[PDB]
Amino acid sequence: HHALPLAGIKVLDLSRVLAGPWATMSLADMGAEVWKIENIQGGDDTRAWSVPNYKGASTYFLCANRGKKSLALDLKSREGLEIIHELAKQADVVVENFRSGTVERLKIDYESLKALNPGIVYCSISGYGQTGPEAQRPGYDFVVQAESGLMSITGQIDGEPTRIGVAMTDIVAGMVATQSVLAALYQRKTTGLGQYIDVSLYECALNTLINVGSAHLNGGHVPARFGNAHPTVVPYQIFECSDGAFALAVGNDRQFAILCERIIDLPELAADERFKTASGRALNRAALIPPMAERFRTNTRQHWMSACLKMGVPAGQVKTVPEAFESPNVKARQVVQKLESAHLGPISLVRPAQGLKAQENAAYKAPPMLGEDSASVLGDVLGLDGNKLADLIAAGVIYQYQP
Amino acid sequence: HHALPLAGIKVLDLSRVLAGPWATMSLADMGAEVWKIENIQGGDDTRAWSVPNYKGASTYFLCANRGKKSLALDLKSREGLEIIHELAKQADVVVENFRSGTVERLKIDYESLKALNPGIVYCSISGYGQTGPEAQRPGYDFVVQAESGLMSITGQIDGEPTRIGVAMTDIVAGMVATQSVLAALYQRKTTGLGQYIDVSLYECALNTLINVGSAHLNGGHVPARFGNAHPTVVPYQIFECSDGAFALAVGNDRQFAILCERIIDLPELAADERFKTASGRALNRAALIPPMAERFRTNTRQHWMSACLKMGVPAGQVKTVPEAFESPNVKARQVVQKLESAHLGPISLVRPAQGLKAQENAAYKAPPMLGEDSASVLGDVLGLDGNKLADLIAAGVIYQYQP
């Protein structure tokens, strides 16, 4: 109905776990055809992560594999490699995040596929990059959160370093890789040529240090833990109320004055030279927060949030994940999306966030069962007849999901 | 030397704070020319956030404004709007994250600029989107972390919900917006037309719930707090050693067996049916972790990490941000980047993570001073002569940084 930007782009998706699979899911969400190549023995690693499960299937797998066609294949087999190379001749993009040396060992490395298809955009996501001393080193989100410095600044001030409840660095690396693939496809419209992309999970994590890292790199400022407070914006933190906590976020000097004179009734704070400007509130933070905290404990959370809403002071409340999906805009903008799996029935996912108009009424293929699309991809893309498909199954080269 | 993918792309950057500025910095990192339009009174909001500062300048501003030309301008002035519209006729992209209704009030909204330039790709980043009940509502990273459910799952199990030490959701929204702009530019090479993009910070945050959200949406599983543990992968968490903590990450059943039989010397665990598979280790987590934790306290952190490295079990250590920038690959791959500011001297930043080869030897403009490039942009892009530039300065329409 509404054509998506990447229609006609074909992706040979060798990725697994989360970082790569999120990149190719995103390319699919923007209109690409994705051929998820999976090992016959269990396929993507996330398929084995069956705690929790929906109707016996990994829920982890569901979150990053919308819109993909699953071809279960024996990559080490002689016949399986031939299939990969025939598909690479048709492919616009290749994405892989195997351990170091795997693609070379399997002859699906960039140089091998480049000879088959010089226009191919080849994207490799690795823990620490393809060069340097730690190139051989495995990359996991939890390790990168520890070593990137994200954990050292996250958590309670006196508490221990804390990880994020999700694998945020893998998501970031997948989003960065999506940018790289898109920009290389854009350049290919002129040069006609592909190229190799080396995305590093660790460098993606370092990029997320933003203001904390730039202060360290410029002036040598040593990072500190601020808990639920911010290191530069004040008052920008959680405050305790009589019945519970609420998040207060003032961005500009005008909002702070409104808070003091119209909501918490401490007009002297807005008059004080220490607290008038945002730079002054950070310096004199120690003197500003305590009187505010005392004032907030006098009323309930709903009282303060209603006052903030009337007066225009940005405030929010800590919501559980189930509460978040009940928010008014989730219902209004139809954020939660219903897809139909032939075998699992309806599957609900958060819709793509790119904000392209052609995505609103787009119909998305549900996350595939292992090998759900083996015969469809081989028939449509390579023209394999029925007889050849039966030979491949008998030899164990391919697997097709059977109800 | 090495041409970048977006060379020749021109961006009219009206964004401020972090989400938008990160999107246009990324477009600049991939080769675009960016015209950062800033209010004469202080410019970007981050410029006022001078705690911490380097040589008196905001370090926060430095992290998201590499590669941009700063034009200090009075957007409400009659002459300033004319400049914006003349630049929009030359622009390939527009990016804005003003409060709701600002662009309409200033006549820089999408419909106004679309008539000037039908090919313009217009990207608007908002807190909750451009439609629905909360469209008028302000969007701040701290509020979205609270309300998206990220805080409810992050932090110690018995502790209070905790935010991330950086504004991760704004970074994610900027990265998503970069994808949207790129995909729309790719489609424009065929259709010849621009389009409007509506990126929602809140929906970008919901996308990051990945496996936690998909389990909730499929099977109604209620999320729980796991602290430094993972909800689905075991043993994947922090363990205490005699002298301190270390992060252990086993992804596959083979690594778990090696850990038990070759490192911690608890071979019975690998033999137990409960702990043999990853799905079984999550179910029987309560019985597996305690014996492992007891075993780790018998030796030092360095002993266990050395053993993990020899045997191939992925492990890591919690590093401070300064420690992270001393890691071997940061030095080898030249991750930290030195730029020259005319007025601040050398400025160090983390290099772009897209992994394009043309970025390795690219030279990047240092983050600009307010109005550092006002005369250069007006002269080069609009052909304004010296006499006209002097009139604009005298009337207060533009500001040029003076040493």
UniProtKB/TrEMBL annotation, chains A, B:
Keyword Transferase listed: yes
Entry keyword rRNA processing: no
Protein name per UniProt: Formyl-coenzyme a transferase
GO MF entries: CoA-transferase activity
EC numbers: 2.8.3.-
Keywords, alphabetical: Transferase
Ranges in a coiled coil: none
InterPro entries: CoA-transferase_III_domain, CoA-Trfase_fam_III, CoA-Trfase_III_dom3_sf, CoA-Trfase_III_dom_1_sf
Matches recorded under Pfam families: CoA_transf_3
